[PDB]
Write a protein that holds these residues in place. Structure first.
Motif, mmCIF file in Angstrom:
data_model
loop_
_atom_site.group_PDB
_atom_site.id
_atom_site.type_symbol
_atom_site.label_atom_id
_atom_site.label_comp_id
_atom_site.label_asym_id
_atom_site.label_seq_id
_atom_site.Cartn_x
_atom_site.Cartn_y
_atom_site.Cartn_z
ATOM 1 N N UNK A 158 -80.355 -11.608 -1.239
ATOM 2 C CA UNK A 158 -79.326 -10.945 -0.148
ATOM 3 C C UNK A 158 -79.159 -9.887 0.176
ATOM 4 N N UNK A 159 -79.185 -8.723 -0.065
ATOM 5 C CA UNK A 159 -79.828 -7.396 0.262
ATOM 6 C C UNK A 159 -81.511 -7.321 1.234
ATOM 7 N N UNK A 181 -74.602 -7.376 -4.743
ATOM 8 C CA UNK A 181 -75.138 -5.875 -3.669
ATOM 9 C C UNK A 181 -74.915 -5.892 -2.692
ATOM 10 N N UNK A 182 -75.540 -7.087 -2.149
ATOM 11 C CA UNK A 182 -75.041 -7.354 -0.536
ATOM 12 C C UNK A 182 -73.644 -7.098 0.637
ATOM 13 N N UNK A 183 -73.702 -6.571 1.328
ATOM 14 C CA UNK A 183 -72.215 -6.413 2.404
ATOM 15 C C UNK A 183 -72.345 -7.464 3.518
#
Ligand SMILES: *[C@@H]1O[C@H](CO)[C@@H](O[C@@H]2O[C@H](CO)[C@@H](O[C@@H]3O[C@H](CO[C@H]4O[C@H](CO)[C@@H](O)[C@H](O[C@H]5O[C@H](CO)[C@@H](O)[C@H](O)[C@@H]5O)[C@@H]4O)[C@@H](O)[C@H](O[C@H]4O[C@H](CO)[C@@H](O)[C@H](O)[C@@H]4O[C@H]4O[C@H](CO)[C@@H](O)[C@H](O)[C@@H]4O[C@H]4O[C@H](CO)[C@@H](O)[C@H](O)[C@@H]4O)[C@@H]3O)[C@H](O)[C@H]2NC(C)=O)[C@H](O)[C@H]1NC(C)=O
Ligand SMILES: *[C@@H]1O[C@H](CO)[C@@H](O[C@@H]2O[C@H](CO)[C@@H](O[C@@H]3O[C@H](CO[C@H]4O[C@H](CO)[C@@H](O)[C@H](O[C@H]5O[C@H](CO)[C@@H](O)[C@H](O)[C@@H]5O)[C@@H]4O)[C@@H](O)[C@H](O[C@H]4O[C@H](CO)[C@@H](O)[C@H](O)[C@@H]4O[C@H]4O[C@H](CO)[C@@H](O)[C@H](O)[C@@H]4O[C@H]4O[C@H](CO)[C@@H](O)[C@H](O)[C@@H]4O)[C@@H]3O)[C@H](O)[C@H]2NC(C)=O)[C@H](O)[C@H]1NC(C)=O
Ligand SMILES: *[C@@H]1O[C@H](CO)[C@@H](O[C@@H]2O[C@H](CO)[C@@H](O[C@@H]3O[C@H](CO[C@H]4O[C@H](CO)[C@@H](O)[C@H](O[C@H]5O[C@H](CO)[C@@H](O)[C@H](O)[C@@H]5O)[C@@H]4O)[C@@H](O)[C@H](O[C@H]4O[C@H](CO)[C@@H](O)[C@H](O)[C@@H]4O[C@H]4O[C@H](CO)[C@@H](O)[C@H](O)[C@@H]4O[C@H]4O[C@H](CO)[C@@H](O)[C@H](O)[C@@H]4O)[C@@H]3O)[C@H](O)[C@H]2NC(C)=O)[C@H](O)[C@H]1NC(C)=O
Ligand SMILES: *[C@@H]1O[C@H](CO)[C@@H](O[C@@H]2O[C@H](CO)[C@@H](O[C@@H]3O[C@H](CO[C@H]4O[C@H](CO)[C@@H](O)[C@H](O[C@H]5O[C@H](CO)[C@@H](O)[C@H](O)[C@@H]5O)[C@@H]4O)[C@@H](O)[C@H](O[C@H]4O[C@H](CO)[C@@H](O)[C@H](O)[C@@H]4O[C@H]4O[C@H](CO)[C@@H](O)[C@H](O)[C@@H]4O[C@H]4O[C@H](CO)[C@@H](O)[C@H](O)[C@@H]4O)[C@@H]3O)[C@H](O)[C@H]2NC(C)=O)[C@H](O)[C@H]1NC(C)=O
Ligand SMILES: *[C@@H]1O[C@H](CO)[C@@H](O[C@@H]2O[C@H](CO)[C@@H](O)[C@H](O)[C@H]2NC(C)=O)[C@H](O)[C@H]1NC(C)=O
Ligand SMILES: CC(=O)N[C@@H]1[C@@H](O)[C@@H](F)[C@](F)(C(=O)O)O[C@H]1[C@H](O)[C@H](O)CO
Ligand SMILES: CC(=O)N[C@@H]1[C@@H](O)[C@@H](F)[C@](F)(C(=O)O)O[C@H]1[C@H](O)[C@H](O)CO
Ligand SMILES: CC(=O)N[C@@H]1[C@@H](O)[C@@H](F)[C@](F)(C(=O)O)O[C@H]1[C@H](O)[C@H](O)CO
Ligand SMILES: CC(=O)N[C@@H]1[C@@H](O)[C@@H](F)[C@](F)(C(=O)O)O[C@H]1[C@H](O)[C@H](O)CO
Ligand SMILES: [Ca+2]
Ligand SMILES: [Ca+2]
Ligand SMILES: [Ca+2]
Ligand SMILES: [Ca+2]
Lengths: 388, 388, 388, 388
Positions: D25-26, D381-383
């Motif tokens: 996703x990052x 880990x994604x924002x």
């Protein structure tokens, strides 16, 4: 290692199961997907792949503007892995041109692309990914071929070409290739009056092609080829279940040896499987446009001029776009019979969706099952509004 | 497994058929296509590929600004599959540098890149994808080589290098490599007065190179190399059909052993096939700029100083940009003769299209047919306005 | 098929030729290039590849913000084809972690990644692309390893690990692996006082590692390993040509068995080739930051505490950023000797270029030539302003 | 070449080491990453790969809007290289559908996709990348299967399917395939009251599946299959350490032969390794949502209704999203025992992160170590803010 021979018959077709779908227009809305049209599917002994004519631009690229045109110097036959989209990074160019066919003879692949202006076109025949033979236009009016796979038997791969008018008599020839070399060619014979875009399959040492009579017929011409004698004949599907598009309404009785009238100067690439009672015809659901797609079991469609459907399957709903359709089989599958397969081109953009400047397509493909499977419909799935 | 030997003659050339086209600038308008120039084509025994000098940036990347410059630390010889575009994701780097050649000897590939400042350049000779030999500049003025494929015979691959002035006498050397090791080198001999960018082909155990005399000649110098004796000679194409660019108008009589005058200090990489009556010359159509491209059958062009065209084919219209052109053949095709092929670089952007900050190119490539095929023209196809 | 044995000596090093350069930050300005750091190069018997620690985001991706940090759950050892950039689509993940080494033993590849919080890290040792052995932290303070390739001899691949303080005594261990299994390990011996990031090469059945003393030394510690006896020793490069960074000015006399003082608690990964008179040292040109890169021929640097340069080559100008550097050789090249090679990491972005939120790098790599080749400089080539 | 046989027992599990993580996703925030869900991992004899159900769109593509839905015509089982992200350019389509399983029998791979409307679904069983068998819905209510790898023994690959209600009794069947052909099928037996999404592993000629009782149980049903006799039984994990989600709080005593009550009509795919004292259970840390992930050593969990944890490891913190989890092993690793592995799906976007219109996931995967390794946590880990 050995040339393939058409030694099996067709499996019993009791429904169609999903085989491949690339979702190309959906994916290509935001990734580097080539603009295409005229797709098909073809197998090698170890792999089946998607094929189409690239337009030499991505869909989101500004050069997609104008891709409604069929013939340009920017087109090429490409192939890519089954159910992937044709991307810039995963597409292999087979040959350069704007009309094509391709088939593997068991030892290697023959691919044919035609390019040139309308009055001066030429076919280049590639074999083992090298050009081997070239054929110049004979009627100086858009030399063109199948737009779906050819079929080989013992190294002999017949290919149907047409050169001449789309709206009047034309010159159709059947070339018999081996290792990309011409063994023989014949002018069209039998009672078909106009031939374009043959969709072909092989069984028990005979090749059957269902074609498009663009000039007069809303029933489809059929060419049956003997690849050992290198001879052929032609007629029309007799059935009143008419399978071109656009077309008049279905009558109660069809024509065997002439065009079924009612629509002139227009048509769509299509296909059938003609195998006595095991006979299935594809057609667009709409009589008026390339909308919807169905499979109809029409026993003896080839030879019975009153034959009507005894079974059917929806492939694409009539509220979704279709397009070209054609035949292929995995000749190298293990098993006692050849499993019939087909693909439907799902055309998007122009002329019907004209808020975008481009025309492209995605692919859906099915193979036959000896089960009676539940049906779904398989639209392209893209939202044109996203491209505005 | 065995070294290739040049055992065949050229096939009869009666026209040219389309071979490959990458549409790179069109595609790269919206996908990750590397900026290139100086492209060519070269075959291995199982695959033919496109080659070019990358500029180490994509076309839409901001680093494409300034790619009009020929020599930087960001350049590399890359190769990629036939008729694909040179993308970031499908390009293989052969070696690092800003001038190159490459050829397969039948067992494996030799590639040569030159890098360095103008006064201190060096060639690294790679063989089986490992560096094997290095050659330092001998005249401290842009050591440079062919920018198209070399040719091998029994393991011996001669390569033409030039070091020295572009506008006055220079030092040209012919290196004879085997397995990337230097067997021998010779200084240029015969009557050619300046040599750059040799385009080469092999037949019947002899290698013919058509080069660019940048200093004085608008006719092209020719080097003929015996790769068994490892000796060579040089002269000019005698024909008055002059094939450099820019160039004066064609006269009625050419020069065999001196430069044909009229333009100084300028030129373009080009090629010919010199085979008695089977002789074809390429040239830009324009005498003034790199515009248009044609093939002219000029029987005995090499040796007849009054020879004029007896046949021709348009490759690129004079309203479209061309650029470098060069020779290659598939030495591994099956058949009784070697089929001549060439590519034309279609340069776009600066200096002539200066509303963009970059310079790049796409490729078109043709091979000879023993048919008399209809002609098309093959432009790059990109709309520069799209990049504004 | 057989384990490789270190049976050759080093070739004579008379200069360095360009080997590979990926231009990653330039290309990645507009294409899908992964953010990396800590790169290196390593060969298999049929292919040499680039290696680095990915940060699990592209450079233009918003997740590149914060990639100045060394250790996160988003890092992985990746490899990709020589001189390509590390892209999302062409990078192969070797293993997950934030410190690594990798080497091929002649039959297959061992790769080692360490991951975990600072106080609880672990090494996973992969062999033939499967995890085989795991080693837990022994000093609970950032277990870490070479960040460049290991070297194997007859199946034995020694690897240097350090666990403990970066700024005071730490616990360094030499593991001797075979097929990913631990044959033996030893605590550090000899006179090196702190070890990190060993850069290693193999010749004549001995492995030489040039390391980073982060605590006290501006001269580099050296570990020499006998992979048959599985024993080692350590000392410092004696030369006054000091090769860490930052560092004091060069003196006239160095230290053999202790750290050369003047800078504490800092350093950079580097390398040398220590081979009597054939000895070359790499260093940043700047004493103060990771700027510039040069190669200096320093005969007997290992053993002579007054040895000064007799030759040199600029790799990166002092007005360009450098970074980590390390050793590798193609152990599988044909020929009588091993050709020394190295790479330099060209770091861009933070902390020195702080108008961008990211830190990344590109790679340049050279191998030795027995010619005296002209020199160029090889900067990253990217314009940071383009990323604003 | 030979069919694999389950001839080893499980290795001793003393902790879990990191195996693979794709950071999809990052990475996909700015590159062409397909939207997925329902991922898993599966090995071939020469390669382990990631698998998932594509949604036939990229994450940044506008068609990601609506990907919270589970079943559409745009879904397909894809696979891609270990720890790469599922991109448009590196993903291979296994088959078309919205529920799947896949496993390699030692000679080649069987993959199964189910597609169709809810009331008329069908399974297509592919073997050696060709469709071989088709199975029509038997209860006309979402025919569905494992969503993680099947396991084979001597060519026999059992597969658990369920057709019928998600919230009441359903019809579960165990098909026994060989070369994609049905050898036998059985209706569910033993005391499990509802079965979905079996996660399976093989050891010592027995296959153990830990499943999801969606209707009533917060303990997990278990199916144990004898692939030689082609018979099976079922029960629940006895342990009071309850491993579905959502779930009530843990009691002191569990249930062996009935559902542990407290939550109805909901659940998550999960897994365990049931091997006497060497027994490890996975669960979400939260009882209320798919948040956090832990591994708990629960000796005799299968058979002891009072068994509590004696050891544990955090995989995902309770402040991070998890999702589906499942079992796989590399059956082809060398060594005396099979190393247990699992993956956790890290779901992002809807329904919990509803400022984005999409739902997708990344993958983390671990294998067992006989060391007691330090633990880390492994979030996606994604924002999400980056996607706004
Ligand atoms: C789960 O999945 C199941 C499998 O897919 C699905 O069942 C399938 O259902 C479809 C949709 O209904 C069936 O397709 C149809 O099949 C018709 C033929 O079957 C009839 O006729 C036979 C012979 O007389 C009978 O034997 C047969 O009876 C048997 O089977 C029955 C099951 O349905 C069973 O109940 C009985 O007991 C018995 O055993 C049955 O009566 C076929 O005729 C039909 O096609 C026509 O109709 C379509 C409109 O729906 C058109 O789109 C199509 O083109 C055909 O009509 C057009 O052409 C005809 C022929 O020329 C004309 O006569 C018509 O007038 C019409 O012409 C107009 O339209 C044309 C197209 O636009 C146009 O060109 C013309 O000009 C004109 O305007 C359809 O294919 C399918 O066979 C079922 N499959 C199976 C195995 O059962 C099931 O429904 C799903 N279940 C659930 C719960 O969702
Ligand atoms: C379908 O496809 C067909 C195949 O492509 C296509 O037919 C092809 O048509 C092209 C275009 O016309 C032909 O190319 C030309 O060939 C010319 C040579 O042929 C002539 O001369 C021979 C010898 O004297 C004759 O044998 C020959 O006759 C035979 O063939 C005829 C068919 O065309 C047939 O009708 C006859 O019965 C007979 O059997 C024929 O007369 C060749 O000369 C010409 O090139 C020159 O002209 C071009 C301008 O068009 C220039 O661009 C080119 O550079 C050449 O002219 C320049 O240089 C000359 C030599 O130095 C100078 O003398 C000229 O003055 C001129 O110089 C100026 O321009 C230069 C370039 O800018 C500049 O540098 C100078 O300084 C100066 O300014 C051309 O190649 C081709 O051969 C045909 N191919 C075949 C097999 O027929 C057909 O048309 C297509 N069909 C349809 C329906 O579209
Ligand atoms: C085309 O390409 C050619 C090949 O690349 C290129 O020629 C090359 O030119 C470079 C650049 O000049 C040469 O590199 C230098 O080599 C120096 C050693 O050679 C000298 O000393 C030898 C022993 O006493 C002599 O044998 C030798 O003479 C021979 O060769 C001559 C050719 O140059 C020839 O003319 C003679 O006839 C003879 O046969 C020669 O005199 C080497 O010393 C030098 O490195 C130092 O200097 C650099 C500054 O330029 C520093 O960056 C570097 O770090 C070294 O100095 C620092 O460290 C020293 C040692 O500790 C200290 O003593 C110095 O004070 C200095 O210390 C400061 O700086 C440090 C770094 O910042 C810092 O850490 C310190 O604290 C302190 O602040 C350099 O490597 C190269 O060898 C040439 N190669 C060849 C084959 O000739 C040619 O120029 C190009 N041609 C064109 C036309 O462009
Ligand atoms: C470096 O890495 C090391 C390795 O990872 C790491 O050490 C590891 O530390 C973790 C985190 O603490 C340990 O995991 C725990 O293990 C617990 C079991 O061990 C205890 O019980 C045993 C039997 O009675 C004892 O043998 C054992 O003693 C031995 O080992 C000790 C080391 O820790 C050592 O000091 C001793 O000398 C001795 O030799 C020890 O006492 C396990 O119980 C625990 O899991 C529970 O707790 C978690 C909360 O932290 C929950 O998330 C989890 O679900 C379990 O509790 C829930 O369920 C239980 C069972 O049903 C209920 O009883 C609880 O009430 C609770 O229920 C609530 O929560 C549920 C979940 O939300 C919910 O569903 C319920 O409804 C209810 O609300 C945990 O796994 C691990 O074993 C250590 N590993 C090793 C090898 O030591 C070390 O810390 C790191 N070092 C550094 C410096 O960072
Ligand atoms: C490296 O040296 C080792 C040790 O001598 C070689 O190993 C022997 O190889 C032969 C033939 O392949 C075997 O039959 C012996 O059993 C091996 N082992 C020993 C300990 O003698 C190895 O082949 C050498 N590597 C290479 C590339 O030659
Ligand atoms: C995709 C679509 O919307 N196809 C529809 C059918 O749903 C139907 F409504 C029909 F009337 C018909 O031809 O059958 O029209 C076509 C279509 O709009 C036109 O033929 C041409 O514009
Ligand atoms: C692509 C293009 O537009 N090429 C044209 C020719 O079409 C022609 F018009 C010509 F005059 C000529 O040189 O032959 O000019 C060139 C060109 O503009 C210039 O030489 C340089 O600017
Ligand atoms: C790339 C660059 O610009 N490197 C320069 C050198 O050109 C030089 F000028 C120097 F002074 C020096 O350290 O040698 O400064 C460094 C650098 O700016 C600093 O050390 C840290 O900010
Ligand atoms: C990722 C996350 O933020 N997970 C949290 C836990 O950190 C915890 F706080 C908890 F309360 C719980 O269920 O354990 O809530 C969930 C979550 O917010 C909800 O269950 C659903 O909205
Ligand atoms: Ca028609
Ligand atoms: Ca000139
Ligand atoms: Ca230091
Ligand atoms: Ca439940």
């Amino acid at each position: 290692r050995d040339f393939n021979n058409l030694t099996k018959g067709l499996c019993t077709i009791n429904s169609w199961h999903i085989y491949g779908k690339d979702n190309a227009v959906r994916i290509g809305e935001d990734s580097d997907v080539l603009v295409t049209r005229e797709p098909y599917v073809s197998c090698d002994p170890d792999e089946c792949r998607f094929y189409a004519l690239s337009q030499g631009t991505t869909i989101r690229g500004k050069h997609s503007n104008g891709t409604i045109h069929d013939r340009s110097q920017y087109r090429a036959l490409i192939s890519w892995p089954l159910s992937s989209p044709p991307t810039v990074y995963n597409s292999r160019v087979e040959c350069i041109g704007w009309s094509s066919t391709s088939c593997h003879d068991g030892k290697t692949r023959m691919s044919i692309c035609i390019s040139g202006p309308n009055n001066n076109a030429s076919a280049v025949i590639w074999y083992n990914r090298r050009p081997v033979t070239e054929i110049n236009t004979w009627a100086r009016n858009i030399l063109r071929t199948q737009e779906s796979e050819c079929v080989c038997h013992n190294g002999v791969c017949p290919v149907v070409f047409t050169d001449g008018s789309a709206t009047g008599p034309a010159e159709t020839r059947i070339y018999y290739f081996k290792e990309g070399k011409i063994l023989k060619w014949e002018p069209l014979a039998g009672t078909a009056k106009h031939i374009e875009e043959c969709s072909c399959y092989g069984e028990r040492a005979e090749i059957t092609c269902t074609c498009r009579d663009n000039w007069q017929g809303s029933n489809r011409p059929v060419i049956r080829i003997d690849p050992v004698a290198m001879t052929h004949t032609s007629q029309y599907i007799c059935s009143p279940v008419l399978t071109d598009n656009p077309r008049p309404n279905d009558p109660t009785v069809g024509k065997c040896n002439d065009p079924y009238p009612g629509n002139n100067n227009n048509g769509v690439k299509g296909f059938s499987y003609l195998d006595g009672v095991n006979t299935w015809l594809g057609r667009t659901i709409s009589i008026a446009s390339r909308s919807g797609y169905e499979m109809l079991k029409v026993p003896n469609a080839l030879t019975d001029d009153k034959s009507k459907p005894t079974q059917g399957q929806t492939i694409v709903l009539n509220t979704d776009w279709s397009g070209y359709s054609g035949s292929f089989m995995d000749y190298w599958a293990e098993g006692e019979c050849y499993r019939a397969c087909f693909y439907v081109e799902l055309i998007r953009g122009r002329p019907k969706e004209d808020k975008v400047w481009w025309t492209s397509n995605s692919i859906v493909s099915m193979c036959s099952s000896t089960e009676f499977l539940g049906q779904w419909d398989w639209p392209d799935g893209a939202k044109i509004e996203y491209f505005l």
